[PDB]
A paper describes a structure:
The Ton and Tol systems are sophisticated molecular machineries essential for virulence and survival of Gram-negative bacteria. Both systems rely on the proton gradient at the inner membrane to produce force and movement that are transmitted to target proteins associated with the outer membrane. Ton is involved in the uptake of essential nutrients such as siderophore-iron, vitamin B12 and carbohydrates, while Tol maintains outer membrane integrity and plays an active role in cell division. We have solved the high-resolution structures of the E. coli TonB-ExbB-ExbD and TolA-TolQ-TolR complexes, revealing the inner membrane embedded engine parts of the Ton and Tol systems, and showing how TonB and TolA interact with the ExbBD and TolQR subcomplexes.
We hypothesized that the elongated periplasmic domain of TolA was the main source of heterogeneity, and we engineered a construct with a TEV proteolysis site between Ile50 and Asp51. The stoichiometry of the TolATEVQR complex is two TolA, five TolQ and two TolR. TolAQR is a pentamer of TolQ, a dimer of TolR inside the TolQ pentamer, and two TM of TolA binding at the periphery of the pentamer. The structure reveals most of the TolQ subunit (residues 2-225), the N-terminus and TM of TolR (8-40) and the TM of TolA (4-34). The periplasmic domains of both TolA and TolR were not visible, suggesting these regions are flexible. TolA TM is a 40 Å long, straight α-helix, tilted 20° relative to the perpendicular axis to the membrane plane, in the opposite direction of TolQ α−2 TM. The highly conserved and essential TolA His2221 makes multiple contacts with TolQ Ser28, Trp32 and Ile29. There are two TolA in the TolAQR complex, which are bound to TolQ chains C and E. Comparison of the two structures shows significant displacement of the cytoplasmic regions of TolQ chains A, B and C, whereas the structures of the transmembrane and periplasmic regions are virtually identical. The two structures of TolAQR described in this report show that TolQ can adopt different conformations, with a high degree of flexibility between the cytoplasmic and TM domains.
Residue numbers in the entry:
A (entry chain F): 4 to 33
B (entry chain Z): 12 to 37
C (entry chain D): 8 to 223
D (entry chain C): 4 to 223
E (entry chain E): 4 to 225
F (entry chain B): 4 to 224
G (entry chain A): 2 to 223
H (entry chain Y): 8 to 40
């Protein structure tokens, strides 16, 4: 019904934290 | 339909960077 | 300014790409206005056709707006006009009458789709070609650099700088013409494919009710 | 060296291009993980429904079993429920000729197939834009960055590679991120369109094969 | 000093790659100019015959009008003439079974329709070939130019990249003219195949209409 | 060997890109071997059933042989078994029109044909994406190596080979491995995809043949 | 250019020897396949029109089947489709267990199987030109990158360096791309042209098979 | 059925030669100095 | 019959003149 939008907001939360920790790990390498 | 990567304008950047090394005259 | 001092070939290349930029924006705006009208018009007619009002009444409506007949109305009117023409001539069997009428739909439906998409193929060329017109602009800028740099005791970045400037500007305008065109070409082309399926869907269900009308 | 130190000093336009391309990377990875989960569920559900429907259970039983869960219905089960509901409505309430009720059911199926199918392809055409424009937006950020460098450099009386190279290195970031935002969208858009086309073909064959049963049932 | 004297001074291999890529650019633009006019005429002739076929004239009267141009027939008229000839032959031969007459007429249309399309697409595979190899022929000229430059740079003791500027310049012109020969040919190959597929679909759709007419006529009379 | 220490000392981004491209290279070879083995077996086994079916054996005898193999079924035999089982089920269950048992058999054949083609074209779509984007993943690693070369050339009033070489070696290796992961997929993908379409045309012709036989059988009653 | 390619091949690292040997091989194999397949597609094109002319001569098909048994172990192309179709037609017509409608499609299977076996004999090495035309420039480039890395590793053994000493190592590495493109260009031209020719002969065999199955159908019912 | 033919512009081989050439110039800049 | 080869030769000649005009315009701009 509408829960697929909340699943999309959950999907944005996991892609955002995965990119934040990727760019943090990349910066931490130097 | 398909969609590939298009990077043709990267040739233009590489040709400018290549010329910049040529211009250094060591 | 640079455009006044640049070589005659680069003036033409920059004017072609500025021309493709303003033309591709004008086409993107105009096709969006047209496809917005055609989508709203089509769904508004489908609800009229399936209302349970008899087809002869919708034909008398269409006879009044014959001039501004577009989209599903212009498919319907062409099909029903040909059906009435052949059935009132009575020269053929009912299964042959609806076959001729269904062709008069398909001709009219092609005539509408070829009017909806009329400038969309050009955006496909602008999005494909603008990178290579940039690539030609940079090769001509690199020519102006190498013909000087190969003809001196020791070069400098100072003497090649106008060749780099002409090259990078021609690439920047090449990308600026390409991005709106390659973005909007797939968007507009997918909206045309949606209307093609919508009209093809109508044409079959209208052919089916005519087949039952003809045997009746 | 660290990316944040180069980001903070950069021109407003290339700094804005970074936020666009990072935004496309963030959004495209969310859309890929969301869509691939939805298409996996749809593929397994449609395959399970063809095995249920063709098992030889009577359509009266299979309809009332379907009707018990109508609020959360999807895929071939939605197409069946929409078709049989309209078939029953027309053949019971109006009792027109067999073709007149069967075309009405076929229209009701065609609507629900289009409605289910656009619910599979909700945000897929966004990946088609990201995969096609992202490398060009990256390259525009790089070409602008190299020009900017030369504009700052051009005041110097005698230039050298050592003073322009930091500006070129800062400018190549927009090409690298323009590709990093593109690769995953390219891989996914080309694959998800095959999977949706495979489901479209499955639903379309179910419509024809079920329409033949409604046609024969109404004719008898 | 200038592109003219650079081309005159260039190695015999770069001159040969120039003549090959100009030769393909000449030939591919000639094929595009010919084929776009052929497909414009064929698409118009198909629509201009099919309206007449659907004008309500008897097929026998249309065939008699077409017999007077047997030496000139093309497109949907040549598909119609091939279909009707084999129909009016097979129908009379035995007072024959209608399915066997109508299949034979539909097959006479199909073979005549495939025989017509190979006259429309005749040179199109050459555009697809020119568009495929021209990047590689340009790139071969580029790599050979860079090799000859780096060999010459290995021979002189005070080596510097200033010594190879004209060798890299002719190598870059060779790839640039390679993509110039490629691009019109690749875009035109895709575009002319879309046009031939649209026109093949129109001929295929006409064979179904005419097959239904023949099937209904044969089952009425036989 | 010191080569492992040089790899450990490379940039974190290039270490990830090497794991992605070496992962794609290994997965590409594993798919090319596995799909070549499967498509060889499926092409041979389908042909070895078509002759059996056309041997002039009565189809009920062939079906009761196939009932003894019901867990091992694949290809043209799984299409046959699915068609004949549904034909018998419908023709036995009630007095149905002969078109209805022919349509039911034709459907049961469609479903099992599609379901068997999914078992053949399992990892060929992925192999196609490796052959397509592997050079562009190498290109991204190459631009990262070039960027690490320029940021070193900018650092000191006279640079040296030992300072720039880390960026160059990362860029050359990312170019080389980007090509090495593409080559197997680029040769095999079009070949394997044509072999799946070869079997699709075999199964479609077997369906057309067997449908005509079942139609000609049903109309005897 | 004027540097010795055998001296280069002797000096270069083991993997550049294998890459040059593979690409030179591909080129030789590519030309050998193009020459051989050009003769075979020429012969098959003559056989197809020569047998079709014999078939439509009005001679009785049982006489052509007797003539074909005079070369049973030497059949090719269109005559092989005819012989194998007529063989299976005679074999089934003898077993009266089959109605004529159940003979003709059984015989048409023996035709379709035989046409497939003939096309495998025409097409046999064509899908090798498709790999040489597509991986060859990538194999050449993988060789170069390796040769360029080898040149800088050999240079880096001494801290004192000059462009004059590494420049021949660059030129010796670029040969792998030059050969890799030289093997690719003929293979792309010929893969497209030989597919175009094979696709025409498939269409002639398909048209012949529909023409002959109609002759079997009316003869079985007569 | 029908065959198909390899019509598309593969830009990757050209792009890789320009990248290799840039990397040669870039590595040799401190050698020429 | 032969008119298609006449129209082909006309297209070859037109395309050759167009190339001569284009390469003349490029060479003229080189100065």
């Amino acid at each position: 019904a509408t829960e697929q939008n909340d699943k999309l907001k959950r999907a944005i939360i996991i892609s955002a934290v995965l990119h934040v920790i990727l760019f943090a790990a990349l910066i931490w390498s130097s | 339909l398909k969609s590939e990567i298009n990077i043709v304008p990267l040739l233009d950047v590489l040709l400018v960077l290549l010329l910049i090394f040529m211009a250094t005259a060591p | 300014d640079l455009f006044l001092k640049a070589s005659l070939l680069v003036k033409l290349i920059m004017l072609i790409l500025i021309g493709f930029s303003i033309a591709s924006w004008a086409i993107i705006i105009q096709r969006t206005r047209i496809l917005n009208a055609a989508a709203r018009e089509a769904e508004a007619f489908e609800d009229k056709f399936w209302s349970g009002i008899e087809l002869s009444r919708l034909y008398q409506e269409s006879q009044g707006k014959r001039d501004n007949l577009t989209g599903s109305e212009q498919i319907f009117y062409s099909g029903f006009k040909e059906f009435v023409r052949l059935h009132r001539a009575n020269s053929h069997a009912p299964e042959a009458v609806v076959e001729g009428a269904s062709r008069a739909m398909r001709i009219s439906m092609n005539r509408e789709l070829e009017n909806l998409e009329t400038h969309i193929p050009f955006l496909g060329t602008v999005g494909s070609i603008s990178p290579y017109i940039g690539l030609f602009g940079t090769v001509w800028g690199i020519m102006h650099a190498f013909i000087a740099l190969g003809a001196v005791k020791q070069a400098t970045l100072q003497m090649v700088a106008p060749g780099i400037a002409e090259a990078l500007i021609a690439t920047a305008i090449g990308l600026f013409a390409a991005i709106p065109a390659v973005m909007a070409y797939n968007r507009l082309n997918q909206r045309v494919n949606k209307l093609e399926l919508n009209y093809d869907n109508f044409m079959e269900e209208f052919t089916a009710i005519l087949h039952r009308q003809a045997f009746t």
